[PDB]
Amino acid sequence: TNLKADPEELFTKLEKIGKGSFGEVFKGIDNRTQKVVAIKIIDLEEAEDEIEDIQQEITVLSQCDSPYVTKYYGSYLKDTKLWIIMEYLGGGSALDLLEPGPLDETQIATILREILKGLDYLHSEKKIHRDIKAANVLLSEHGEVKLADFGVATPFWMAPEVIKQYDSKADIWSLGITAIELARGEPPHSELHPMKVLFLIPKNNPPTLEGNYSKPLKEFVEACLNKEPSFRPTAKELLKHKFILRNAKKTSYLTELIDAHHHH
Numbered sequence: 001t002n003l004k005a006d007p008e009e010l011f012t013k014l015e016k017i018g019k020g021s022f023g024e025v026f027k028g029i030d031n032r033t034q035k036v037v038a039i040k041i042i043d044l045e046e047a048e049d050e051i052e053d054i055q056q057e058i059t060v061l062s063q064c065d066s067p068y069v070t071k072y073y074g075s076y077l078k079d080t081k082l083w084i085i086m087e088y089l090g091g092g093s094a095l096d097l098l099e100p101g102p103l104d105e106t107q108i109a110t111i112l113r114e115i116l117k118g119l120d121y122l123h124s125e126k127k128i129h130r131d132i133k134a135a136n137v138l139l140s141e142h143g144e145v146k147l148a149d150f151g152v153a154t155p156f157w158m159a160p161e162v163i164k165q166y167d168s169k170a171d172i173w174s175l176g177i178t179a180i181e182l183a184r185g186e187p188p189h190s191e192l193h194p195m196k197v198l199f200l201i202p203k204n205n206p207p208t209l210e211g212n213y214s215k216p217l218k219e220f221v222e223a224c225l226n227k228e229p230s231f232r233p234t235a236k237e238l239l240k241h242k243f244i245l246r247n248a249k250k251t252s253y254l255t256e257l258i259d260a261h262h263h264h
């Protein structure tokens with residue numbers, strides 16, 4: 001963390017984007033390069049009890065160097081405010097892109113494949129994302145798909161063993177929930193109170209994808225959503241799943257989805 005430079009001289013802060021954890025996030029401009037960045041500003045007086053969690057997330061992001069993980073550019077302390085500078089992804093989140101109407105299975109498979117590429121990277125690095133969900137999957141203006149908002153080391157995407165207190169297979173369960181979310185718009189149990197969901201996830205059989213979806217997509221979901229973690233496939237294995245191979249296409253086609261969101 002840079003304690004000498006003035007981030008208000010280095011960056012121009014523009015409009016708020018998304019909905020950041022611990023602090024609001026703004027579109028910003030690097031005044032030296034004129035590149036757009038994302039800027040989170042956290043008041044460290046008001047967010048005192050969470051400082052260790054903030055530090056832990058900075059450390060993890062700073063150790064990641066992947067096309068599939070949002071890049072970390074640095075942080076600055078100005079008076080009581082911590083500025084965190086990240087890669088700007090102008091397409092918004094996958095969750096935002098559900099708003100105009102349902103995805104088709106090519107779009108679902110393409111987004112899942114790119115998420116899987118990020119999980120393959122993290123798991124190979126002995127890391128766990130811990131909060132895979134559509135709101136934490138960001139798209140660039142070119143359709144590139146990247147992971148954001150790592151979980152700290154709401155229940156709807158949590159694996160049963162996480163709730164009951166795990167390894168990288170918890171991310172695979174969360175991916176299965178995210179696949180349902182990309183197909184249906186919301187995760188299982190979304191109509192229920194979160195305290196009820198907390199006991200339902202360990203108690204119940206795993207969710208299935210209900211509706212008129214291809215059998216490969218339903219089987220992709222079922223494979224991720226096994227109560228036994230060792231029965232879930234790895235991210236590497238799921239990149240070869242027939243649903244992915246038969247349906248995923250070039251990520252650049254996702255710009256059509258981004259444009260549809262701008263037109264809605």
Ligand SMILES: COc1ccccc1Nc1ncc2cc(-c3ccc(-c4cccc(C)n4)cc3Cl)c(=O)n(C[C@H]3OC[C@H](N)CO3)c2n1
Pocket residue numbers: 017018019020021022025038039040053054055057058061070084085086087088089090091092093096135136137138148149
């Ligand atoms: C037009 O663009 C958008 C429109 C709509 C939505 C998103 C964007 N585009 C975007 N592009 C980059 C981001 C980088 C961070 C970001 C992430 C983590 C940290 C960070 C690092 C270390 C420690 C801590 C505590 N935090 C800092 C930042 Cl800067 C960020 O928060 N968002 C907004 C956020 O996206 C995910 C969603 N769940 C809630 O909103 C980001 N949005």
